[PDB]
Amino acid sequence: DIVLTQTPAIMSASLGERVTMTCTANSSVSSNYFHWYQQKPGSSPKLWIYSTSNLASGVPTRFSGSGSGTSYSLTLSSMEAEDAATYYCHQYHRSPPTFGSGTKLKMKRADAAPTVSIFPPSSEQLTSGGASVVCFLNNFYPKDINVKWKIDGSERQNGVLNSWTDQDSKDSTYSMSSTLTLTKDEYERHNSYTCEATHKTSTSPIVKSFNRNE
């Protein structure tokens, strides 16, 4: 089980940037049996480069591959958004064949502020004794973002589930969902619920609230 070490583990690139990523082996591997794969989230790997430098069918010519012995690389001459993916190296010089832990290539793009929306518990949910407040933070960049929940102006940290989308295929932004779940009893004992997003695009937080009076 020949160890393959890919670097960088994570990297970003703007449209047009040249990208090179490396795969280093702990033992020598024949170039004929060294291959690369591309994988996007939720889908299967596809063969990308085979036998070090041959492009798989449908792979655009801006890709190339190179190497021998213990050092291999994949090169992207000009980054496009469809190229954001994880790339994996593969050796079949020895059984068991092994693969790298991947270089995750992301798209860099202009900063963008999140569009924030807040939603109270549905009466359906309340009927069953639960109360979830939901906040969506849509189409922002960069990924780094701090959502805070406040109840009558006091921070709540417990009972919050946050989920991020992967970079959008078209605009390369992220979106995020934040769900604060309380008991119906706890929820009905306060008036205002506030979702606050801090993001580098504003010195002030983007804030949405509702009150149980409207």
């Binding site: 049996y33 063969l47 085979y50 991947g102 949910q125 589930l161 979106s175």
Partner: protein, 205 residues
């Protein structure tokens, strides 16, 4: 055209076994080896073994030679992987893929997600998220296992597991003149419980 069609996602209890399938089409089944690989979320690929359907010979990673059994049926051009004595750590996406020139892996199945857990299969509770462009959504709560599909009539967020139940949400952005004059409905399917929900987005009060 070559295609490898894998069987659906399965939830299995720890201690049990399961067998998944990989139906091949578009080439001579016996002329190519099929490999099987495991990929846990966030991680790279780990090779399990391969099947040669010509002579029924399979070859294993030493790590899996106990747990995994690779078979094939020539008549239906289907390869199968059985995993036994399952535990949490077997939860992963499993791929079959065809061996091509110089043992490159040229065609891949779509993956079979295996979940190993003691948790109860549970259908979702679906809740409407109601307040020029207006954002609506729906909260899909209290279900197990993955996956759920959400369809409207869009951002759909990956599910988050807590206390063996998943929470997922989906947001939709329409113009003001559409809602609430029109019906807006999020359609949730949870194939593991064979359930669906047609939830109308109703205004409050």
């Amino acid at each position: 055209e070559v295609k490898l069609e894998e069987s659906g996602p399965e939830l299995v209890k720890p201690g049990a076994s399961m067998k998944m399938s990989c139906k091949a089409s578009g080439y001579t089944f016996t002329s190519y080896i099929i490999h099987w690989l495991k990929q846990k979320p966030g991680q790279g690929l780990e090779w399990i073994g391969y099947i040669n359907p010509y002579n029924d010979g399979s070859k294993y990673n030493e790590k899996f030679k106990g747990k995994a059994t690779l078979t094939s049926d020539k008549s239906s051009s289907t390869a199968y992987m059985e995993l036994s004595s399952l535990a949490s750590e077997d939860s992963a996406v499993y791929y079959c893929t065809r061996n091509y020139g110089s043992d490159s892996l040229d065609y891949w199945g779509q993956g079979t997600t295996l979940t190993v857990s003691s948790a109860k299969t549970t259908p979702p509770s679906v809740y409407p998220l109601a307040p020029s462009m207006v954002t609506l959504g729906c909260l899909v709560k209290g279900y197990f296992p993955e996956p759920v599909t959400v369809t409207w009539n869009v951002h759909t967020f990956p599910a988050v597991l807590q206390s063996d139940l998943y929470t997922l949400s989906s947001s939709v952005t329409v113009p003001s003149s559409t809602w609430p004059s029109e019906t807006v409905t999020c359609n949730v399917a949870h194939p593991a419980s064979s359930t669906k929900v047609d939830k109308k987005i109703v205004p409050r009060d």
